[PDB]
């Protein structure tokens, strides 16, 4: 049973991208990781996942940002990152075709 509860999670970007997309953003849905890179900064931390919603960058709440928004935080937040996510299966699930939550929290895709 995967925790609930905000965290917070420091990401460190080097000489990459931070190695995660991004989705949401219309009309205060929520921004929510939807891939993480295997081997990349985000991954790196071992802390995030997909369908965590990003409720915030380096402190700046985002949990209704437009995804232009969200991306610009994202790029700008420099070296060290700092985010508190929590984990949302279900309205991430949405955003996803052909995607379910199942009876152990995780999201499935068929």
Same mark, same amino acid.
């Given at each position: 049973? #995967? ?22 953003? &219309?009309?205060? &849905? ?11 900064? @985000?991954?790196?931390?071992? &802390?995030?996942?997909?369908? $965590?919603?990003?409720?915030?960058? =380096?402190?700046? $709440?985002?949990? =209704? +940002?437009?995804?232009?928004? @969200? @991306?610009?935080?994202?790029? =700008? ?7 508190? +996510? ?9 955003? &996803?075709? =052909?995607?379910?939550? $199942?009876?152990?929290?995780? #999201?499935?895709?068929?």
């Amino acid at each position: 049973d #995967i925790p609930r509860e905000p965290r917070r999670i420091v990401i460190h970007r080097g000489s990459t991208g931070l190695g995660f997309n991004i989705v949401g953003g &219309e009309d205060g &849905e929520g921004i929510f990781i939807s891939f993480i890179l295997a081997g990349g900064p @985000a991954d790196l931390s071992g &802390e995030l996942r997909k369908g $965590d919603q990003i409720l915030s960058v =380096n402190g700046v $709440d985002l949990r =209704n +940002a437009s995804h232009e928004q @969200a @991306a610009i935080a994202l790029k =700008n937040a420099g070296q060290t990152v700092t985010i508190i +996510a929590q984990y949302k299966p279900e309205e991430y699930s949405r955003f &996803e075709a =052909n995607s379910r939550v $199942d009876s152990s929290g995780r #999201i499935v895709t068929d």
